[PDB]
Amino acid sequence: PQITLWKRPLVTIRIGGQLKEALLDTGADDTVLEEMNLPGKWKPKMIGGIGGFIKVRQYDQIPVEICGHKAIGTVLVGPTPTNVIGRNLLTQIGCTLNF
Amino acid sequence: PQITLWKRPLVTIRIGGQLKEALLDTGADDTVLEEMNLPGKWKPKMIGGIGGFIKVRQYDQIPVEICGHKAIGTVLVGPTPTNVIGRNLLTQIGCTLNF
Numbered sequence: 572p573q574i575t576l577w578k579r580p581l582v583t584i585r586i587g588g589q590l591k592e593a594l595l596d597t598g599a600d601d602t603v604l605e606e607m608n609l610p611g612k613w614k615p616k617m618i619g620g621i622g623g624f625i626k627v628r629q630y631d632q633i634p635v636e637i638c639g640h641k642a643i644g645t646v647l648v649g650p651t652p653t654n655v656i657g658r659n660l661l662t663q664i665g666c667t668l669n670f
Numbered sequence: 671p672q673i674t675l676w677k678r679p680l681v682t683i684r685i686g687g688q689l690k691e692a693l694l695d696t697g698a699d700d701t702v703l704e705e706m707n708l709p710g711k712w713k714p715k716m717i718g719g720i721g722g723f724i725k726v727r728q729y730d731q732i733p734v735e736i737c738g739h740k741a742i743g744t745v746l747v748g749p750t751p752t753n754v755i756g757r758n759l760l761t762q763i764g765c766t767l768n769f
């Protein structure tokens with residue numbers, strides 16, 4: 572689809588068979604999800620945004636379906652105020668910026 | 671142009687007569703540049719992201735040329751980790767997300 576930018580580019584994603592709303596974010600290297608208790612091993616990581624760094628849990632090889640397009644990769648879980656889909660998954664679904 | 675996301679979508683901008691590099695950032699409501707001088711009056715503002723809030727200077731009605739496309743809008747200046755072009759200006763240059 573084409574998503575205009577008049578409002579926040581929030582779309583429905585599926586993770587663990589369950590649905591969430593997340594921001595398609597070209598300004599994000601990584602995918603960062605609101606706290607959720609995923610199973611499996613994780614690694615601690617620190618990621619930085621506008622206000623500084625937060626502690627997140629790094630889960631690898633997590634399937635995430637974005638607006639019907641399938642992806643699989645690293646998902647960071649922690650105290651973010653919004654679910655963010657970053658470039659690591661946006662590339663997998665063939666997302667471009669266009670003007 | 672069409673811009674893919676295997677790398678950060680960095681572009682050259684022209685502002686206050688100077689060239690800079692900034693990140694096309696669909697996850698940003700606002701446009702935020704590293705500390706610099708801009709002409710005219712500004713207002714103290716706060717903006718928030720991952721990691722928390724920062725103090726910025728709000729400059730209104732500032733012309734900025736983004737890859738040769740013109741915009742005139744609000745530019746925030748402060749201790750952002752990196753220069754970002756947000757939706758307020760991406761909409762002005764006709765930028766959409768496509769997949």
Ligand SMILES: COC(=O)N[C@H](C(=O)N[C@@H](Cc1ccccc1)[C@@H](O)CN(Cc1ccc(-c2ccccn2)cc1)NC(=O)[C@@H](NC(=O)OC)C(C)(C)C)C(C)(C)C
Pocket residue numbers: 596598599600601602603618619620621651652653655657695696697698699700701702717718719720751752754756
């Ligand atoms: C309604 O609030 C916003 O729109 N907030 C925006 C904002 O923070 N947007 C975030 C996503 C977001 C939106 C709303 C609430 C919380 C988070 C991003 O669009 C822009 N931001 C811009 C940004 C970019 C880079 C960096 C950075 C950090 C460390 C080292 C180098 N760069 C910091 C901020 N990117 C990041 O923070 C990413 N950081 C990143 O990719 O780091 C490499 C994350 C996400 C992976 C953490 C601005 C403050 C930029 C206006």
